[PDB]
Nucleic acid binder design. Structure first.
Lengths: 350, 339
DNA sequence: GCATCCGTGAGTCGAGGGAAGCACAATTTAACACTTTTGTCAAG
DNA sequence: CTTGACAAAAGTGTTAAATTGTGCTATACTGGGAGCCGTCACGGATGC
């Protein structure tokens, strides 16, 4: 309803409100010391999906190497933007480089550069450049017949990676048990392993690599940005109408006529909520009233046929989508699936 | 497209690159390893495997998701206090749960390709996709990479199963059980084949014979009557959009002014008729016929009220009823209300 | 000033117009006796 | 007004039969499909 009452209270455009309401952009509620493109993130800032992933999960790109060719970089080497990872591919970001699927493992026995071919259904169980005693498993596979082991002592070298993963993170080698596990979020100074010996030097998501027995902290921030009416309701619950009225009144004295006209329209809405006793967050529905059945009847005509109203169809759609969202939430579905259902549920209420 | 929900969804699922054969196996192996690791964690700590998985899932999904957090944090620390050998399974569980989310996200194009074949059967395109997504989640849990069959081979069964079941459960205002929907669909298929071969609409005898043993024309007609969708009360009639079905359907529940008036007239006359009866005789009839409490009182139940035996009440009531018959014949003021 | 999005457009009547299957566990329903409760009969 | 026997109706299991609800299927499959102009003309309100 132009002009939107929710937008006027929150000072959000018609386009800004729709983008958040229908899960097209994020709105920041707590920057958590986040920096976006070198500019600190501020509250009530609209973040696109690409920006949110960059802040919340960090930067990482995967470059597929051509078959047969061998990477010019090693496993776990930091690279800079534009550096050549493989003979034909150059990275676009600076970070640690990690072999994805080493096709061939070249163990050097001491007495012998034996080479072993790795297939899609096989995985390397040891890191690069590790002293493997005679008998230790090298390449694990479904069939024990195809399992690859070392005849005697040697050094394992990984070659011919399927792809190169460049991740903007910090690598902290460790020897004893790690104090954190995969998925944890840590800030600088947080203990990582070895009873406080290893500590985080930057904010990010911690992922522990058992094969390389190192802890990778992917540089990212625990930003609080949300979409939909759950974000808008959060903003509406925090409004201080008394405080807002004073700000609008002070802006009512500005020499500009256009500025004074805008403040009057906003303050007319604020006055309506202050005098009426209504709460701004009541404009977001948490419970949907259901009309009495006799006002949306399902009656049987004289001929035996059934006639019903269109409200029952609209109610059924909202109930079908509400129930499905509950099931998906209990299943721990990915955010893409949850977002689509939340967007559908919003449209069902509309 | 913001105004187009489908284009917006397709754009979102297009941001996740498709998994290669090597990537798919690694994700599946991690999912399988995580489930096995959770089983060992339950044995080590004695916690419910369902409870452990929820805590592990909660930590992976982060604080961006709404058992309260205090209990989740408490159990999370309890797992982190395990010895080094036992702590490793927690690391495997965390990597397994993270892999499961990625494996589901990489196959959202598969559900769209399947779901586009089920439109026009009662559910919208986005509803079909969401029902397909639920089947895709189930396929991830049950999938086994040991068999060396590709994921789409096995996940396609569950995606179609979920989409097809959703239609059977949500496509009709008056829900019909799954088995009855299968009968209805088969009956429609059988009729269409007979219709194309006879060059005309088959009769209920042709359809019943085609269906097989246990089917007759009476059953075929009943099934077709059951499969009739209700008609909307807002369907326009005529070129002008000013008349609807609901404007021609009378309300036959509430009594009409004539019905209500005749009910009060009958009660008013009966009150005068019972006045001629004795003080107790009128009360007995007003109880035995439910004219006081609204519900009939049995001979014994009435007797307790007046402290008289059951047989006696049946005598006075029969006698009191006989007297009312005598008066009516002398006036005939009560025969009209009997129709 | 222009560019964009929204809501508005007489009344009464009238006929006419109403594309998978199967195996199995669970749950609901219908039949079958068998057991109190109710209306009756004859008496006293 | 009060019993005493009487057969039927209503009520209480008990159990087999319909009925309904739920899970599963392993070659590989991975981003929709309809539409589209006598687009209705005018004035108001808002965002620039």
């Amino acid at each position: 309803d132009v002009p939107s009452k929710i937008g006027t209270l929150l000072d959000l455009s018609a386009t800004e409100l729709e983008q958040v309401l229908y899960f097209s952009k994020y709105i920041v509620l707590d920057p958590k010391g986040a920096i976006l493109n070198g500019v600190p993130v501020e509250k009530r800032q609209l973040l696109t999906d690409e920006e949110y992933r960059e802040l919340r999960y960090g930067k990482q790109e995967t470059y597929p190497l051509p078959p047969g060719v061998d990477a010019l970089v090693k496993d776990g080497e930091e690279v800079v933007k534009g550096q050549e990872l493989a003979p034909g591919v150059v990275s676009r970001l600076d970070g640690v480089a990690l072999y994805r699927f080493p096709r061939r493992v070249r163990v050097e026995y001491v007495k012998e550069p034996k080479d072993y071919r790795v297939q899609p259904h096989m995985n390397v169980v040891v890191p690069e450049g590790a002293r493997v005693e005679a008998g230790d498993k090298i390449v694990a596979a479904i069939d024990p017949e195809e399992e690859v082991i070392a005849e005697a002592e040697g050094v394992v070298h990984l070659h011919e990676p399927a792809s190169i993963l460049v991740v903007k993170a910090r690598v902290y080698p460790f020897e004893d048990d790690v104090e954190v596990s995969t998925g944890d979020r840590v800030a600088p100074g947080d203990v990582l392993a070895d009873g406080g010996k290893v500590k985080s030097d930057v904010y990010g998501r911690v992922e522990v690599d058992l094969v390389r027995n190192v802890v990778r902290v992917v540089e990212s921030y625990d930003i609080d940005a949300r979409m939909g009416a759950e974000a808008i309701q959060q903003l509406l619950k925090e409004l201080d109408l008394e405080a807002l009225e004073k700000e609008l009144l002070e802006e009512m004295k500005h020499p500009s006529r256009a500025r004074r006209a805008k403040a009057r329209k906003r303050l007319e809405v604020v006055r309506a909520f202050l005098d009426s006793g209504n709460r701004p967050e009541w404009m977001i529905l948490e419970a949907v009233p259901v009309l009495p059945p006799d006002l949306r009847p399902m009656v049987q005509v004289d001929g035996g046929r059934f006639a019903t109203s269109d409200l029952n169809d609209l109610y059924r759609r909202l109930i079908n989508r509400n129930n499905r969202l509950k099931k998906l939430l209990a299943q721990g579905a990915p955010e893409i699936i949850i977002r689509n259902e939340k967007r559908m549920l919003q449209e069902a209420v509309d | 497209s913001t105004s187009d929900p489908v284009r917006q969804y397709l754009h979102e699922i297009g941001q996740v690159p498709l998994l290669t054969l090597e990537e798919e196996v690694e994700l599946a192996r991690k999912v399988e390893e995580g489930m096995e690791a959770i089983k060992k964690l339950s044995e080590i700590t004695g916690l419910d495997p369902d409870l452990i998985r929820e805590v592990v899932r909660a930590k992976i999904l982060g604080s961006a998701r709404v058992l309260d957090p205090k209990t989740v944090e408490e159990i999370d620390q309890k797992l982190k206090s395990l010895p080094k050998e036992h702590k490793r399974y927690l690391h495997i569980a965390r990597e397994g749960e993270a892999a499961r989310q990625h494996l589901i996200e990489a196959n959202l194009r598969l559900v769209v390709s399947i779901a586009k074949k089920y439109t026009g059967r009662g559910l919208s395109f986005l509803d079909l996709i969401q029902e397909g997504n639920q089947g895709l989640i189930r396929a991830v849990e049950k999938f086994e990479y040991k068999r060396r069959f590709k994921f789409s081979t096995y996940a396609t069964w569950w995606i179609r199963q979920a989409i097809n079941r959703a239609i059977a459960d949500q496509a009709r205002t008056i829900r019909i059980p799954v088995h009855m929907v299968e009968t209805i669909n088969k009956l429609s298929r059988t009729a269409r084949q007979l219709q194309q071969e006879l060059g005309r609409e088959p009769t209920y005898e042709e359809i019943a014979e085609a269906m097989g043993p246990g089917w007759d024309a009476k059953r075929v007609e009943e099934t077709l009557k059951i499969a009739q969708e209700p008609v909307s009360l807002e369907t326009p009639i005529g070129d002008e959009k000013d008349s609807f079905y609901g404007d021609f359907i009378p309300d036959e529940h509430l009594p009409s002014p004539v019905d209500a008036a005749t009910q009060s007239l009958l009660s008013e006359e009966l009150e005068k008729a019972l006045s001629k009866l004795s003080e107790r005789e009128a009360m007995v009839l007003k109880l035995r016929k439910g004219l006081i409490d609204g519900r009939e009182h049995t001979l014994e139940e009435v007797g307790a009220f007046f402290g008289v035996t059951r047989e006696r009440i049946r005598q006075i009531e029969n006698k009191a009823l006989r007297k009312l018959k005598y008066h009516e014949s002398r006036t005939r003021k009560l025969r009209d209300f009997l129709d």
